[PDB]
Structures are given as structure tokens and as C-alpha cells.
Swiss-Prot record:
Residues of the full protein shown: 85 to 141 of 537
Biological function: Non-receptor tyrosine-protein kinase that plays a role in many biological processes including regulation of cell growth and survival, cell adhesion, integrin-mediated signaling, cytoskeletal remodeling, cell motility, immune response and axon guidance. Inactive FYN is phosphorylated on its C-terminal tail within the catalytic domain. Following activation by PKA, the protein subsequently associates with PTK2/FAK1, allowing PTK2/FAK1 phosphorylation, activation and targeting to focal adhesions.
Domain of life, per lineage: Eukaryota
Name of the molecule in the record: Tyrosine-protein kinase Fyn
Subunit-structure text: Interacts (via its SH3 domain) with PIK3R1 and PRMT8. Interacts with FYB1, PAG1, and SH2D1A. Interacts with CD79A (tyrosine-phosphorylated form); the interaction increases FYN activity. Interacts (via SH2 domain) with CSF1R (tyrosine phosphorylated). Interacts with TOM1L1 (phosphorylated form). Interacts with KDR (tyrosine phosphorylated). Interacts (via SH3 domain) with KLHL2 (via N-terminus). Interacts with SH2D1A and SLAMF1. Interacts with ITCH; the interaction phosphorylates ITCH and negatively regulates its activity. Interacts with FASLG. Interacts with RUNX3. Interacts with KIT. (Microbial infection) Interacts (via its SH3 domain) with hepatitis E virus/HEV protein ORF3.
Post-translational modification: Phosphorylated at tyrosine residues, which can be enhanced by NTN1. Palmitoylated.
Domain SH3: 1-57
Length: 57
């Protein structure tokens, strides 16, 4: 399942990942809590994204 960003998000540090609304992600870890480790299908960048900012495609 891919996930798609509902809103733009600007990351605070190198650990979280900035993204634009409509960006799609493949999710690598969702089991660690509510920030999921994800790779952007736009750029390939990988980092934590807030799981409440994305929805399944
Ligand atoms: Na970042
Ligand atoms: Na969500």
C-alpha cells in the first residue's frame, strides 16, 4: 500500500522528512509508533513522516 500526503509538511531535523501534499510514499516501518519511516516516490528520500499526514492511496 502506498500512502499519499494530505498536506505539505516541513521537517524539523534531518530525521523527519519534508514533503508536499500529493507526494506518495512507500512505508518501511509503521510499527515503531505513529511516525513512520517512509521513502518518497518523488525523490527517493527516506525519513520519518507523521502518519496522520498521509492516507493510503
Ligand atoms: Na529532514
Ligand atoms: Na493517515
Amino acid at each position: 500500500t502506498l500512502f499519499v500526503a494530505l498536506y505539505d509538511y516541513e521537517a524539523r531535523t534531518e530525521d523527519d522528512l519534508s514533503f508536499h501534499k500529493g507526494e506518495k510514499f512507500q512505508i518501511l516501518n509503521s510499527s515503531e509508533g505513529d511516525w513512520w519511516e517512509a521513502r518518497s516516490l518523488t525523490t527517493g528520500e527516506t525519513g520519518y513522516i507523521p502518519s496522520n499526514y498521509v492516507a493510503p492511496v
